[PDB]
Design an enzyme around this catalytic site. Sequence first.
Site, PDB file in Angstrom:
ATOM      1  N   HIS A  76       0.804  -1.211   0.000  1.00 12.30           N
ATOM      2  CA  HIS A  76       0.000   0.000   0.000  1.00 12.30           C
ATOM      3  C   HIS A  76       0.854   1.287   0.000  1.00 12.30           C
ATOM      4  O   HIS A  76       0.286   2.375  -0.077  1.00 12.30           O
ATOM      5  CB  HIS A  76      -1.078   0.004   1.073  1.00 12.30           C
ATOM      6  CG  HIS A  76      -0.589   0.237   2.458  1.00 12.30           C
ATOM      7  ND1 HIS A  76      -0.625  -0.766   3.400  1.00 12.30           N
ATOM      8  CD2 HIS A  76      -0.152   1.378   3.040  1.00 12.30           C
ATOM      9  CE1 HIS A  76      -0.196  -0.214   4.527  1.00 12.30           C
ATOM     10  NE2 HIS A  76       0.121   1.067   4.354  1.00 12.30           N
TER      11      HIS A  76
ATOM     12  N   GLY B 137       2.453   6.401   9.564  1.00 10.88           N
ATOM     13  CA  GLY B 137       3.870   6.370   9.244  1.00 10.88           C
ATOM     14  C   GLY B 137       4.554   5.119   9.779  1.00 10.88           C
ATOM     15  O   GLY B 137       5.682   4.833   9.379  1.00 10.88           O
TER      16      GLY B 137
ATOM     17  N   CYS C 196       3.609   1.939   9.282  1.00  8.44           N
ATOM     18  CA  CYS C 196       3.525   0.761   8.410  1.00  8.44           C
ATOM     19  C   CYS C 196       4.882   0.332   7.901  1.00  8.44           C
ATOM     20  O   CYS C 196       5.762   1.166   7.725  1.00  8.44           O
ATOM     21  CB  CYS C 196       2.528   0.957   7.280  1.00  8.44           C
ATOM     22  SG  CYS C 196       0.868   1.348   7.865  1.00  8.44           S
TER      23      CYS C 196
END
Lengths: 304, 304
Positions: free
Chosen positions: B41, B143, B145
């Site tokens: 993503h 932030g 991930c």
Amino acid sequence: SGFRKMAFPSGKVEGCMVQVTCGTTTLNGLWLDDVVYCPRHVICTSEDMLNPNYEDLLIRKSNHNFLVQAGNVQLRVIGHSMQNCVLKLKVDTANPKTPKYKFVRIQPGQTFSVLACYNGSPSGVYQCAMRPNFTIKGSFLNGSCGSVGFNIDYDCVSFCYMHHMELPTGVHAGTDLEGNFYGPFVDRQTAQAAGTDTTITVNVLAWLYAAVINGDRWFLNRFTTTLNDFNLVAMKYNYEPLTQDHVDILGPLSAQTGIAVLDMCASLKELLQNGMNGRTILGSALLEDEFTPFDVVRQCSGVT
Amino acid sequence: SGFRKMAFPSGKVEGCMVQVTCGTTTLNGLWLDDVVYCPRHVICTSEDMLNPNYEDLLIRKSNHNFLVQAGNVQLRVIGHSMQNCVLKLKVDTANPKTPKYKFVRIQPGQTFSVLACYNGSPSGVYQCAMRPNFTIKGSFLNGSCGSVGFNIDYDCVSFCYMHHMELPTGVHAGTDLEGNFYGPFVDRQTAQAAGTDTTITVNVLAWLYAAVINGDRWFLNRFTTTLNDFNLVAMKYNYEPLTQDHVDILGPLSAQTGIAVLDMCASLKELLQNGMNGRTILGSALLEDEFTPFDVVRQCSGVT
Ligand SMILES: CNCc1c[nH]c2ccc(F)cc12
Ligand SMILES: CNCc1c[nH]c2ccc(F)cc12
């Protein structure tokens, strides 16, 4: 979202851990620049610990009696000295992995991370607080002495604790990196009882703010209180008195949530008087006091 | 003595964290050998997350669109591919700090450490467990991930988790390092509700053994039970069924303490039925389930 008991990343400290052996005792040392810091009781036999005269025991030790090993390579000891309860072993090689560092002596209520080590090798990292009775509740087995406590601000490691002993009650005592014990403890195997382990009120309030930020709000009530009224309740429950300095430090959390510090004190007052009624706050059924207001801001903002 | 929620030392993993940016999205990547792993993503805009067609979005991306930065130095991307929900960015430089590593897919009930990162920089380390509903209760802000979960066995890091998302209930979902989500979760901003978060019974028993070893024994009673009798109570309290495999895994703790596994089950049964009556176990007022029997043995023996 989510709120965890988080330790600082330990890599910078892992690069400083060494093994120190003197005679038959092996513990951990902290290698920064060309000095290795370790508890002075590395010179003691279990018997000496009953009534050690450290100056007298140290006269029988020379540089070559301190075996310092970093990984699988031996460091050459070219000097040694005792500063309070720590030994400083001067080695001929500066630690190439020495980070930017400071030695700080923390106040009770402050938190720090501990890198538990055995034989100079890191086993784990956890977060704890300097209790108001100057003990810490750690996880230390034999061989863990010399493991250190620290805080990290961007790239600077502030070392605040070095592990020395376990009281007969299973709580821990140690020094700052100047070798001065926190509290009245001494490095002797004798009766040393800890005082009252009061709750760090300002940290509990910080954690209640963290709970509100993260969605746990059931404990918020329609009440307010004053510092003097709250403190009458805090005294009753063995909580540290809350001062205006503590209220000021909670200012940013009060501003972010819109909940006045004295309103949060009134929520805490009702939690102390009524309990949680089988409910939880941030996955805990107790009022957590090992997060400072700075820890809550840092974790809730993502400081790296 | 003392028992803490301990994370593995994070240094080996800190040396693998990088920042990955694609367009306007920045998250973390894991650099091992000449490959950087990150959530797929990273190619999405917040809008794309509503119904992303990852294969279609990836066609519009070339190697030069993936900006990978390790510290303050840029890595050159020479290939990219999607494996399940992760992207693998081939870079021209092998990570000099690559530790010995494996990719493992853990089972629910297993614990691991998470190195929370933002912009490729480590912020903190904490211990958690893969819940039986395949979520984790972490501490992750925007932030975070690409932050990873891992276990360490001496010098080998076994990576088991990569962070991808937060459900609307504040719990976390992610993949193994092959990009397969734990549980039924998908990398889409849609209604994804978690199932029952049952308690990891074998871990609770392991933690009760840790409590006995560390001196907390008030909960030990004069009773015993059977697996079937205990499980009737476990079902009632949303505890995972205890099997003979779990009893076998608790064997070393039973042997060390001299308390038969079924006797400890009877203590747990009374704790479930009667509560703690305002008492605590290892500083907790809840029955802790994020320590495996292996964690208890490791912490109680000092494995480095
Ligand atoms: C603090 N005195 C009451 C009390 C005992 N134990 C507690 C645990 C949580 C809480 F909110 C209150 C209590
Ligand atoms: C598990 N059902 C009763 C219960 C609710 N909450 C609890 C917390 C601790 C404990 F030992 C028991 C309980």
